[PDB]
Amino acid sequence: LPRDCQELFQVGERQSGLFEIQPQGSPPFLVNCKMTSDGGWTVIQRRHDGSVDFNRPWEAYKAGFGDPHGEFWLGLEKVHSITGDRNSRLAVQLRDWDGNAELLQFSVHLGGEDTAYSLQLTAPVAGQLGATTVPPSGLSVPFSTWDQDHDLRRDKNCAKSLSGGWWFGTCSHSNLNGQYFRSIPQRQKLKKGIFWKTWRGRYYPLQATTMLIQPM
């Protein structure tokens, strides 16, 4: 069995879809691979119609949930079995309600559960994401869900005030795992939506997202 999508690409697999892989120290599981000029990408998240509830607790974000032929979240322990401790490219694809698309890419490291699946960002990459003052040693941002939220403020639970699970560095940078919306609701619920502040705004609900990862 191939270790990951990139191994699949490297033996000549051309089609994007569902394939059986087995990383190190993992049981076999079925991934979504995307085959591109750039090689094999692992699809770790995909949203496009609001048919799958993303407002799930810690254990569901670890194991994964959703339809692998539709909207889904692959699962932090599956993603981390794929990346290991290797530097990885993370691709983030957004789509607004006018058909426009926005393609972003960041090199990251992803810790395991001992780190609560923290994203480890160098200072330049954290600068790319809008952090204006960061130590030269960078930034790690743990994953948070409503039942396991890492906002240090005794008053505030970021995941619980919004929706879904995410790397909430702040509570207003992004959340691609929020509540899916089609049109304008009555502000206090748009807070809880699918958003990426620096593209269409804090309160603009995205039509579609994909996240993909690829080691190195």
Numbering used by the authors: 184 to 369, 371 to 400
From the article:
These proteins, human angiopoietin-like protein 3 (Angptl3; also known as Ang5) and angiopoietin-like protein 4 (Angptl4) are, as the names suggest, related structurally to angiopoietins which are involved in angiogenesis via their interaction with the Tie2 (tyrosine kinase with immunoglobulin and endothelial growth factor homology domain-2) receptor. Here we determined the structures of the fibrinogen-like domains of Angptl3 and Angptl4, structures which offer new insights into reported loss of function mutations, the mechanisms of action of the proteins and open up the possibility of rational design of low molecular weight inhibitors. The fibrinogen-like domains of Angptl3 and Angptl4 form compact structures and, according to fibrinogen nomenclature, can be divided to 3 subdomains A, B and P.
The Angptl4 crystal contains 1 molecule per asymmetric unit and the visible polypeptide chain begins with Leu184 and ends with Met400, hence 6 amino acids of the C-terminus are not visible. There is one break in the mainchain of Angptl4 at Gln370, suggesting the loop that it is in is flexible. The B subdomain of Angptl4 is similar to that of Angptl3; however, the extended β-sheet is formed by four antiparallel β-strands and instead of the long β-strand β6 in Angptl3, it contains 2 short β-strands (β6 and β7), which form an antiparallel β-hairpin and are connected via α-helix α5 and an extended solvent exposed loop. Similarly to Angptl3 it contains one disulfide bond (Cys341 and Cys354). Similarly angiopoietins 1 and 2 are the closest structural homologs of Angptl4, with rms deviation of 2.7 Å (200 equivalent Cα positions) and 2.6 Å (200 equivalent Cα positions) respectively. For Angptl4 there are two reported mutations (P251T and R371Q) which are linked to increased triglyceride levels. Of the six mutants made in Angptl4, three gave no soluble protein (G223R, W349C and G361S) while one resulted in greatly reduced protein yields (R384W).
